[PDB]
Amino acid sequence: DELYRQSLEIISRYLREQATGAKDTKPMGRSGATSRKALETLRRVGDGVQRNHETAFQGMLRKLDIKNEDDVKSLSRVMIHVFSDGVTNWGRIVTLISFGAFVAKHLKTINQESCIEPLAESITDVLVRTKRDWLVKQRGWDGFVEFFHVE
Ligand SMILES: Cc1cc(OCCCc2c3n(c4c(-c5c(C)nn(C)c5C)c(Cl)ccc24)CCCN(c2cc(C(=O)O)cc4c2ccn4C)C3=O)cc(C)c1Cl
């Protein structure tokens, strides 16, 4: 499943980098150029999204009461509820990932960094399993990058 692996490398790097403040300088895998431009796209757009929904993000974070990895594994159901039904567009997907980053920052603050990568997996798993065909028709991460690109 190459779509899942690409999505997880992008999402995982964006989440851990938002939580630690440090960029990950390890080379990317195949489709490296696209994934690097996708992660740059998320650094430009994602922080605007998080500031924009700060009130709603904080409310939802508190209502989910995340404390350990078992809590992290119990988040897919609400995630799926909020994300699955209705219209899909790239902004919705950025919002998914962006709240992911918001939560990853929280996990780092309560010294639960080890939960960031299960978080990332859960996010990727919900994305690819619920939006795969859409992702394929928007040409995947190249479609994402082209969508948010301005010259
Ligand atoms: C990591 C993780 C990610 C995650 O992601 C879930 C999917 C992303 C998401 C959406 N929404 C969220 C809200 C939220 C709520 C509730 N109220 N308000 C005001 C907000 C901003 C919060 Cl607090 C957090 C995340 C989201 C609802 C509104 C925007 N929207 C959207 C919803 C719709 C729609 O309902 O059809 C259409 C949309 C958008 C955005 C663009 N379009 C077209 C979403 O799909 C969820 C969880 C639990 C986890 Cl753990």
Side-chain angles (χ1 to χ4, degrees), residues 1-29 31-50 52-72 74-84 86-150:
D1 192 346
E2 151 79 7
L3 179 59
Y4 170 92
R5 167 213 85 68
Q6 173 166 51
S7 314
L8 170 65
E9 206 149 80
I10 288 154
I11 289 155
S12 178
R13 295 194 175 210
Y14 184 61
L15 264 57
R16 303 174 283 108
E17 162 187 339
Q18 290 267 304
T20 72
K23 295 179 184 182
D24 179 6
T25 64
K26 283 182 40 143
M28 317 262 190
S31 310
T34 302
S35 307
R36 203 233 304 129
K37 314 202 198 159
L39 171 74
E40 298 169 50
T41 300
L42 297 164
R43 322 183 221 265
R44 157 171 62 93
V45 172
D47 305 38
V49 171
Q50 292 170 61
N52 261 251
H53 292 300
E54 188 144 46
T55 305
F57 281 8
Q58 183 74 9
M60 166 76 62
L61 178 58
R62 296 189 183 176
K63 284 187 216 145
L64 309 157
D65 175 49
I66 309 172
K67 313 169 314 288
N68 60 53
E69 170 174 303
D70 287 300
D71 299 330
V72 172
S74 310
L75 291 174
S76 57
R77 295 246 159 77
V78 48
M79 214 183 118
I80 280 161
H81 178 72
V82 179
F83 185 59
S84 84
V87 186
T88 310
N89 63 21
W90 279 120
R92 184 139 201 212
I93 289 168
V94 180
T95 311
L96 179 76
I97 298 163
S98 283
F99 188 61
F102 194 85
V103 172
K105 286 191 276 200
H106 171 86
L107 295 164
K108 159 73 190 198
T109 313
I110 64 169
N111 175 285
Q112 293 287 343
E113 212 169 319
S114 75
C115 298
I116 292 171
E117 180 85 19
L119 184 53
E121 285 159 0
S122 186
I123 293 169
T124 304
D125 163 76
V126 172
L127 174 60
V128 172
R129 104 164 150 242
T130 60
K131 301 310 163 157
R132 180 182 307 275
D133 285 344
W134 189 91
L135 283 323
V136 172
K137 183 121 209 321
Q138 319 280 93
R139 295 174 317 108
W141 288 103
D142 289 306
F144 174 74
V145 158
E146 165 149 54
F147 188 84
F148 294 105
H149 159 60
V150 188

